[PDB]
């Protein structure tokens, strides 16, 4: 998250390739889960707050 490289929202990559997920909450670009748009860190933070519906703590 260098608020300038958060130009991912650009949508004008010239070539669809250069497009890269990047976290919506931290800007974290290295563990962004498609399904949540979040990074592994925040995905864990919010899940603890119960702010991610359905998402519980698995155990078996």
């Amino acid at each position: 998250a260098r608020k300038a490289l958060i130009e991912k929202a650009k949508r004008t990559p010239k070539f669809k390739v250069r497009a890269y997920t990047r976290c919506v909450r931290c800007g974290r670009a290295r563990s962004v889960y498609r399904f949540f748009g979040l990074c592994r860190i925040c995905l864990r933070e919010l899940a603890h707050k119960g702010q991610l519906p359905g998402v519980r703590k698995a155990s078996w």
Partner: protein, 206 residues
């Protein structure tokens, strides 16, 4: 560093979610990014009302929502002049057109999120930490509660060496998955830096 967030740990039982809206692998990330935008504003302003919780329900563009505060009035306004601007601020954010109820927090001293916010403010005004903690634990313990605890981080009193003040009474069994313990975390900027404040209130078991 040990111990899981007592809420994320108790979602199964003694503690429901803060967003009861279903979704599929194509929109979930959106309805999620939305809730955050919501809580983003709600908290950016309603701070003065003292917002403990903020649920968000859904069914289809009819985004229920709610906001449990200690001082409703602050939300409402003269007759309802504030609860108006904001209510439009939601649909201007997301052209979803949604409700915006308001629950009152019976006791703001049995809601960890507030108790935390409480002490957190005092810290910024420069109140003696240990006092605040001692007191806070009391407010909570006096107005009911079978137990309670409060934790402040470090640089207590502007000190260079970060410490960690304690204080707690009654029971606060975190290992017991049934305690029903409200947890509240409050930041606390300062001329010299951040101080973290956690709050735990044990009320009722089974």
């Amino acid at each position: 560093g040990n111990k899981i967030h007592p809420i994320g740990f108790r979602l199964g039982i003694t503690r429901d979610w803060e967003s009861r809206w279903y979704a599929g692998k194509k929109q979930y990330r959106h309805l999620l990014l939305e809730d955050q935008r919501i809580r983003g504003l709600l908290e950016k302003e309603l701070y003065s009302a003292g917002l403990a919780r903020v649920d968000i329900e859904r069914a289809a563009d009819n985004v229920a929502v709610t906001v449990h505060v200690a001082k409703p009035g602050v939300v409402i306004g003269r007759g309802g002049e504030r609860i108006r601007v904001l209510r439009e601020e939601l649909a201007k954010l997301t052209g979803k057109n949604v409700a915006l109820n308001v629950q009152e927090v019976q006791n703001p001293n049995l809601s960890a999120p507030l108790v935390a916010q409480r002490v957190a403010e005092q810290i910024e005004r420069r109140f003696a930490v240990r006092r605040a903690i001692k007191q806070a634990v009391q407010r909570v313990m006096e107005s009911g509660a079978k137990g309670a605890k409060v934790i402040v981080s470090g640089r207590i009193g502007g000190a260079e060496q970060a410490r960690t003040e304690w204080a707690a009474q009654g029971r606060v069994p975190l290992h017991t998955l049934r305690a029903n313990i409200d947890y509240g975390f409050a930041l606390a900027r300062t001329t010299y830096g951040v101080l973290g404040v956690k709050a735990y209130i044990f009320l009722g078991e089974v």
